[PDB]
Design a protein around this motif. Sequence first.
Motif, mmCIF file in Angstrom:
data_model
loop_
_atom_site.group_PDB
_atom_site.id
_atom_site.type_symbol
_atom_site.label_atom_id
_atom_site.label_comp_id
_atom_site.label_asym_id
_atom_site.label_seq_id
_atom_site.Cartn_x
_atom_site.Cartn_y
_atom_site.Cartn_z
ATOM 1 N N UNK A 35 12.688 -7.271 45.188
ATOM 2 C CA UNK A 35 11.998 -6.145 45.855
ATOM 3 C C UNK A 35 11.261 -5.292 44.817
ATOM 4 N N UNK A 61 7.680 3.037 55.445
ATOM 5 C CA UNK A 61 7.370 4.213 54.610
ATOM 6 C C UNK A 61 6.190 4.970 55.250
ATOM 7 N N UNK B 401 16.432 5.115 46.822
ATOM 8 C CA UNK B 401 15.410 4.643 45.854
ATOM 9 C C UNK B 401 16.007 3.475 45.063
ATOM 10 N N UNK D 154 3.443 -1.533 40.314
ATOM 11 C CA UNK D 154 3.659 -2.437 41.469
ATOM 12 C C UNK D 154 3.949 -1.597 42.715
ATOM 13 N N UNK D 155 3.257 -1.879 43.814
ATOM 14 C CA UNK D 155 3.338 -1.064 45.058
ATOM 15 C C UNK D 155 4.757 -1.146 45.639
ATOM 16 N N UNK D 156 5.519 -2.187 45.320
ATOM 17 C CA UNK D 156 6.887 -2.356 45.886
ATOM 18 C C UNK D 156 7.787 -1.208 45.426
ATOM 19 N N UNK D 157 7.468 -0.558 44.309
ATOM 20 C CA UNK D 157 8.279 0.581 43.815
ATOM 21 C C UNK D 157 7.782 1.916 44.384
ATOM 22 N N UNK D 158 6.674 1.949 45.131
ATOM 23 C CA UNK D 158 6.042 3.247 45.479
ATOM 24 C C UNK D 158 6.934 4.008 46.454
ATOM 25 N N UNK D 159 7.432 3.419 47.562
ATOM 26 C CA UNK D 159 8.298 4.180 48.468
ATOM 27 C C UNK D 159 9.525 4.734 47.730
ATOM 28 N N UNK D 160 10.161 3.916 46.877
ATOM 29 C CA UNK D 160 11.317 4.356 46.053
ATOM 30 C C UNK D 160 10.896 5.519 45.161
ATOM 31 N N UNK D 162 8.546 7.739 45.522
ATOM 32 C CA UNK D 162 8.291 8.955 46.360
ATOM 33 C C UNK D 162 9.635 9.495 46.853
ATOM 34 N N UNK D 186 12.878 3.042 34.948
ATOM 35 C CA UNK D 186 11.511 2.476 35.049
ATOM 36 C C UNK D 186 10.619 3.089 33.974
#
Lengths: 499, 499, 499, 499
Positions: A35, A61, B401, D154-160, D162, D186
């Motif tokens: 993920x 999201x 997260x 990487x966009x997969x980390x963006x919700x996390x 935020x 990170x």
Amino acid sequence: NRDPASDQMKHWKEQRAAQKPDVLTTGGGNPVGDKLNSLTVGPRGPLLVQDVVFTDEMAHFDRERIPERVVHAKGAGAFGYFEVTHDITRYSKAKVFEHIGKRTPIAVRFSTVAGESGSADTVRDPRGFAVKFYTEDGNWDLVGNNTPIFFIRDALLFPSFIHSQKRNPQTHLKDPDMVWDFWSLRPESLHQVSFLFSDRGIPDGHRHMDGYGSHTFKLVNADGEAVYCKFHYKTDQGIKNLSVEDAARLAHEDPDYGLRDLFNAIATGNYPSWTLYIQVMTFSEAEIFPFNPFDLTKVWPHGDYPLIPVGKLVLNRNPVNYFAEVEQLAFDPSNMPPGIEPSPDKMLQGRLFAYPDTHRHRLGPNYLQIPVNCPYRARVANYQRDGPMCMMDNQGGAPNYYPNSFSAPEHQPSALEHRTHFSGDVQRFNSANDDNVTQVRTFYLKVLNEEQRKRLCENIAGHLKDAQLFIQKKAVKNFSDVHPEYGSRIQALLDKYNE
Amino acid sequence: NRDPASDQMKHWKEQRAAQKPDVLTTGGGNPVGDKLNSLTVGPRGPLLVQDVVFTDEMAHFDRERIPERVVHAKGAGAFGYFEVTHDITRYSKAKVFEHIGKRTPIAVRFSTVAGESGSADTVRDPRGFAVKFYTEDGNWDLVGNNTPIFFIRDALLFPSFIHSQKRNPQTHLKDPDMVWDFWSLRPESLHQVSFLFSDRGIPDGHRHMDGYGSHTFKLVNADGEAVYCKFHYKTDQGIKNLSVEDAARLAHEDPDYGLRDLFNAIATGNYPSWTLYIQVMTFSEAEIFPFNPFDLTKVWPHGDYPLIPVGKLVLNRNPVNYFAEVEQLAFDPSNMPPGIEPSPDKMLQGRLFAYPDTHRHRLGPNYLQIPVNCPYRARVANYQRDGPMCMMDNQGGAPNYYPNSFSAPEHQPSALEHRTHFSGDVQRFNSANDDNVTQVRTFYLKVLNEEQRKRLCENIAGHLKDAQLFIQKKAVKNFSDVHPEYGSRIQALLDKYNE
Amino acid sequence: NRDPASDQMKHWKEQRAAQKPDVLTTGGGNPVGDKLNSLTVGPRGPLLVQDVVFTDEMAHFDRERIPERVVHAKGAGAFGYFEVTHDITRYSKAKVFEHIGKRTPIAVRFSTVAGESGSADTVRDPRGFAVKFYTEDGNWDLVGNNTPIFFIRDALLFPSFIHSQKRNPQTHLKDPDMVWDFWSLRPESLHQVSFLFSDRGIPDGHRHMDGYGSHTFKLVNADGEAVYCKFHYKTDQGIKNLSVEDAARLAHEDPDYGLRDLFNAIATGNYPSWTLYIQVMTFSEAEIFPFNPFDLTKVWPHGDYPLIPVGKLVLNRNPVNYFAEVEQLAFDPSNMPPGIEPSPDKMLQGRLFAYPDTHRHRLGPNYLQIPVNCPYRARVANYQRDGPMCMMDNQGGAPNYYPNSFSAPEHQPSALEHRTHFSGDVQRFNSANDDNVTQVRTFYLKVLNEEQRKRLCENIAGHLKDAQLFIQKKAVKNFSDVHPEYGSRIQALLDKYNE
Amino acid sequence: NRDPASDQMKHWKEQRAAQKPDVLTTGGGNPVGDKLNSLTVGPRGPLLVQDVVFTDEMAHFDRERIPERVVHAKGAGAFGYFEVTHDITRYSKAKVFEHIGKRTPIAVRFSTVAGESGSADTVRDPRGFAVKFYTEDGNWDLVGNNTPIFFIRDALLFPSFIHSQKRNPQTHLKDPDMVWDFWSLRPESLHQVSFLFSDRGIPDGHRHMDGYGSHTFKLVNADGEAVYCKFHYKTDQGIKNLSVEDAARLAHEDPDYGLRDLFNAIATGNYPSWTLYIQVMTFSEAEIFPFNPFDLTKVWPHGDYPLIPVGKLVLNRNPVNYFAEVEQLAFDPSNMPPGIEPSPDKMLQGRLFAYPDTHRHRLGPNYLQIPVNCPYRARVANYQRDGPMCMMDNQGGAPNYYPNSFSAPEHQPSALEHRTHFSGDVQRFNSANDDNVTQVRTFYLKVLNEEQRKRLCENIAGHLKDAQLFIQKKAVKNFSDVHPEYGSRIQALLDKYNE
Ligand SMILES: NC(=O)C1=CN([C@@H]2O[C@H](COP(=O)(O)OP(=O)(O)OC[C@H]3O[C@@H](n4cnc5c(N)ncnc54)[C@H](OP(=O)(O)O)[C@@H]3O)[C@@H](O)[C@H]2O)C=CC1
């Protein structure tokens, strides 16, 4: 260590030390291999649609937010119980009051009024103090405030009042011309304006303020006799306020001061409680009350209408998930079990419509199926079906029309509303000139001392100074009509401010 | 007696005969005294806002409807199980296929395509045959049709195709010019148009048709080896079709013929079943297949790619509430557990996006929390939170997260997707001229006999006759390119009709 | 050639032959290079998310559908004008009636009641006949039916009645037990049931039926004097019905018979028209009317309350886009200009709430900003702001609170409602036993002849035959209470049917 | 006198002197007689349903709110123009760049990131700086920030990410453990974290900061040649920042400091402007760039890739209604006219999906029909139809399927996207270890001076101090990997804080 609120994740991890971590899944329950890295054509290539892990998580999201409450957006919640301590069954047959020691689970939300979701807790504003009682006769929502009164006495002015308190429609700025133009043109606001700009305008968190139903309600007993009542729930922690200076410091230092304080109090076993009282006014007394007894700008003097103790509200449980259990909480003043009924209060009558209406919008048609809103101590059975996000079984195959010959649910005549007589024209009757000053004078002269009259006038002048002179003049005139010294003290302070 | 479907309420009452009716409540759980007479001032007086029984019930009624499915709106559902009968673990490590005898709960929805919610079951149309497997690795949605093929092989043409099959945007009438203009301009449609206008265009309810995955999918075994596959689920009840004459009669006599037939079959214990097969094509075979093996207008000849048996689909349970369990059913082709993956089929790739997207609109952001859609045999654990109509606990106080040092869910590397190589420019490759006739000729000459070829041409001519002459001419030319007799038979019939 | 409806696209193309085709764009107005082939990695590779042409088009496709109307889902629409022919200014000061020859634009939607969007036009059911008048005092929605009466006389029974007429909640089938259980338990339905099963149960399209307001309304003149009134709009094309046999044939042959007939009539210049009449009843006459004059199960006899002519309704314009102009049409009975007001009719009172409520759900909070719903001949100016899909300027920077000192909009005392007096207890007055048979007897004996009485009883028996014997028995008893021969004729037919 | 923002209503009133106030109407355009008193039976009687003035206004009030942006909720907006000053025709054929002097209307929204709608403007956070260009080839949304880089690649980390920056899911408090646990795990975040905690972390309102596209984009010229580019728009007002102390004071004194400053600047004719530049990197240069040139954590050094001027962004027009023109503004990075295309930047690729996705939720399916979002300098013409709150004509009777023989819109082959070659496995390539420190070291040693290195480390330590010791330790190690003095300076400050 730090406060229990700060240690939320630390404690969550500790509670689980004996267990292996769960497998990370898509919303559809498919385990996820990675993920952290998107599916691409080569390491420097574009993203594929067949990365359904990415789309599944990002689409959720993208949909996290719901509309904030149109008012009282900023709040804190907890759970606990109501316990009957005294017998008032002579006034109300409501099951929630049935026997001494009887416990009913409650949910509570505290709030400011004007500020949006990101605003500061420690600002001058009324406070919401909403109580949901999960009774066997369904939910009873006592949607109270930290004041016994309000600024207006007709629901048609409520959208205008809230508009005047929020942001200018062009600039998006708080606008003192809007605030004071409205209040100066609507002097019925003098009573609650006086309370708001007093020391109790900024309570020290949620535990140190009173709650009130504010409205006149109607209680009905087992013999079908009715009285009018007010609800008062007084803080067992004692009244405590923040100074203007401390409130302004906490506004930037801890915008979530009330959230943090309530969570920490409950987490450390320092459970806050309130004593619930009623005042009772007979139908005969209502006929000779020197004001409209249903006027939300008026109190019932304690001298003539003494507080009668009923029970205790105790908050002993924090939310586990704030969004699911607090942001989604819906209180409807129209949720009243048998034994509790509305009065003709024009404001309360408007609230009977507005809360379920805004809930259907803000949460959705089936908002009563959200767990915290569910009447989980009653059996819900009716002829309602479908709607979006329909949960449980939608009452299965049960006949969906009434009446029927197939033994589906039946109405229960003992739950019929009490019968009052009315006579009169269908008309818009004026309430604008229903005495705006008398109870305000007694507040200013008898309830406040000299020191708090001084702060009251400084607090008012400190905000009113930013309105245009014609608005200052008209506002001061209204304060003068309460008491000449009320007006002249504010005028003196405005003269100093206007240089 | 009447059929079991007719006796639904009779049986509901009988199942309860020993019990009194439940108490009728508001959505808030408050008992109602009289749900048959409105609250007024006097017997010929106006309706009061304080009638919150009326507003609570009427507001829910006003919100019963949700958008129908953009396609396949008219449908029937039932539930049962899948049972593994043969070992295919050498092709797929998917837990659903893990051992012979293994049983997994399923949900199935059958449908037409073009018709809205009130349309007739027994019309010429493809049939949806969607299967949800509730596996321990989450849901597997095999979103099938009663045909192995489709009209088009690129998703960008899907909205246009459905528009052409729907109503004229001005008149709201079915429009033969729209239907045949599109098909005549897009001759890749010849294969499925031939199937659609054959005898199997109108199956005798849902129990007497085959299901197909249609698309090429990918199976992955425990060694990380992959093959391409097709899914076939053949009716154990045998293929049976309705004549045009019988179909037209049932269309007005019983628009819900398919619903009633499926319900009565299950209610009388005549449980319909299907045998699930796969075809297997190696990556090497895909390289030399004489067509694009991922072209949805093409089948894999049984001669070269024999059916391998896998298991049995059995429907043994009727819905209890159709809205909650069928109208709200959501199948996402993107729901695939480890051991099952997509192929590069351009149509399947589009479907990976479209289903969850339309579901978030039709049902809501949290549609996977609706009980029938919930992966209730997997543990959902991830970093997704909130959204409207959030049920359950919203994963409580779990760290939200990733990554985190607090023991929240972790990805499982064994669930990583099989890694394929592709080489080429990223571009829009034209697929319009990927052989539109060869397999259609085989269908016309070998799969149909003389009797079926005659009806096929009468069915086509009977509809095409209403399109403009220029459209007739260019539709016939496409049929001629399949086989000269295909075109000339249709032209002969059009000449008679255009009389 | 074919009918004008069939030639919609042909005519669209011809009208443009002098022009170049538009450039195909995304929703964002970006020109599209190729909308037929998706962006992939090689001709046999997977789909890229950077194909924003595909996602833009597919996401809009996925969101095309909105909830259908909870009732009257299946409909047809057209536009034209209302023209005053007679002076009724002595009864109503409404600007729409102001002078002879005065013209007001109208929108009309015709509909069935029970069927969903895909159902047939030519079925037994009431017909909706809703008229929107775009007046200078805002919209007047006269939301009428092809009957002067209804099945029930209290809105609390409306959701149950509609449930009884729609699908069984388990089987999703039409259910004669539900239909006749409800009607047999609620004999106030006898009057409209008798009308429904008469010849007028299935009109020959929309142009050959009458419209009625059904409800008693109130008219108010320039002197503040009020009368009660009924609205009648009689077809200038004459009453014409379809035989049961012809209706069943058209149901499968042309499910959209009404749509096609209306479009073709207008397209060929055969504009259908209706004559609008009122009946007038004084407040004195209302006191001595032998029934409740506000009872929706009763007519005002023409003998005592003659039709007074008012004007003409003319439909001379077809919709250009059905979804935008017909599917999104919203009629609110509460949309009434000065000079027209509601009566105390309990049913009408419920409708004042239900229509705007369902519109806010079906269409959205800002549904009055949809062009066909916009009161485009009035200036909308008020203190309402925001909501989703807020169009135009949202009233710009205008002060957003009332009252204000900044010259924003002002209420107009001439628009104040007429003053009617009511006296009584607030209670749920039982109306179930308000004479269910007297006017039904007159319908059966005087309005119908022998031939029509025979068909009426065959139509009823042909449907009622499928209900259980106990329901048949109870329904027949109600028909016997109207007239012994009414019941015995139906019972004779039921005996033959029950073999 | 007061600022122009304070005088908004005063000015509105003045502009209308010599016009009469408009008549106050319902949403349906019906004039209202009295909007200050509710309709009751007698002066102390119950509220009536027939008060449709109250319900119409209250129901709209109940629906004012829409979901706030999931990020960048708190914002200000304005309008003006883009003016081409230099010729970049050799890099991009985009019409917006076609000729020197050429003007395109723009809309801009400035914002914080983490704060909700009522949060303060003057807090440490990135700033959004979104530009919508209304071009002849449709809208171009340059959805920029006040930084050239971001925290993750990487966009997969963006919700996390935020989630980590917003509220604890149990307590609803900002959580330094969440912030620093994410950043410490990170380390790709170090570059933007260093920028965030520098002096530019709190700009002096919106006029005194730069904008950047952040991502690598692709430009395509009229010969079909492509280069990679970065967008920089530098403030013509000059960089100016707020001290931590001044920012904390304005946070409570004027939470809307940025709103007020922008409005007053434009209202007084002090129009803020920015100079738009590109950097250009050939496909050959991209191959030898010492990092991934598509890595959002990296800049292109000015030395190797000089700024090339393009034009000026000027804001000369305030919103007239903030809700309609700013709250409803929707920027989609996927809105790109021909001559402008995405790069393979994994973050940008994610954003192509996320913006239109969240817009369909927050605003609605037809959000591109809201006037500020409408591509009003292009003709929108396509095969998309319907959806909720469909405005304009929904493209009238135009054929709604492609292809067609009826002269409906045609694709324009010159708008085809530029074709790039990529080769590799389709897989999840790990980007976590792609050099996290080198450009950060240059920023710390070369770009900052001694005084700003000191403040940087005090700002970091001042927040990091509240995280657990194990998180402090891991974060300091990452700073040490940038430069040993970076880590040890922060550690020294943490030691003082931890007492
Ligand atoms: N391979 C498949 O899955 C199908 C193939 N076809 C046709 O078969 C050709 C390739 O030969 P091959 O696959 O070896 O077939 P075979 O020669 O092995 O056998 C023909 C099969 O076609 C299917 N079929 C029968 N009637 C119909 C009908 N009315 N509509 C659709 N399918 C029907 C049946 O299998 P069943 O219905 O159990 O699939 C039947 O056994 C293609 O040109 C294609 O048109 C058509 C349909 C299915």
